[PDB]
Amino acid sequence: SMMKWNRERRRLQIEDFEARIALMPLFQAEKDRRVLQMLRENLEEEAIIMKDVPDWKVGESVFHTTRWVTPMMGELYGLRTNEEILSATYGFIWYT
């Protein structure tokens, strides 16, 4: 009885995974826009806050290579409500 039921669950799981696969690319585009939107907002704020500094021109590439480093969580949100950081950073870990 467990043999038959367990395989049924595996057929259920792959169907659930099939839904996730068929529906993943939209979030990839959505997460793509979100982080780039959040980065552009951060740089736009940077172009408003920091002028008096001697030489801290906006948008310096910390990494020498001209690749796209995945944005680390700090400078992603960074200048936001402390609730936003707490929900974004821990979030999933604390949601229980």
Partner: protein, 99 residues
Amino acid sequence: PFFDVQKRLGLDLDRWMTIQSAEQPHKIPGRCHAFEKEWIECAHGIGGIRAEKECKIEFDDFVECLLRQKTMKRLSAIKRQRDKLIKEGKYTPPPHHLG
């Protein structure tokens, strides 16, 4: 290894885990996989003496990704001036920053 017995018989004893860009289970990537791939590929067949100086920016960028040191201080001085600027009312955060 002092005695590369695994090299002779050609069986993997501890090379599966020695670096983070190996055949990870279910292809879950390391955080600095892209930078490590460049550093390893730059420093191959070159030797420790030559590669330590030649492939330097690869190691430094990969170290920065691995440690998150220099760009973290970029953020540290971002908040440093911010607290030193908005406190005396020189500028106010825009609505999206407020939430």
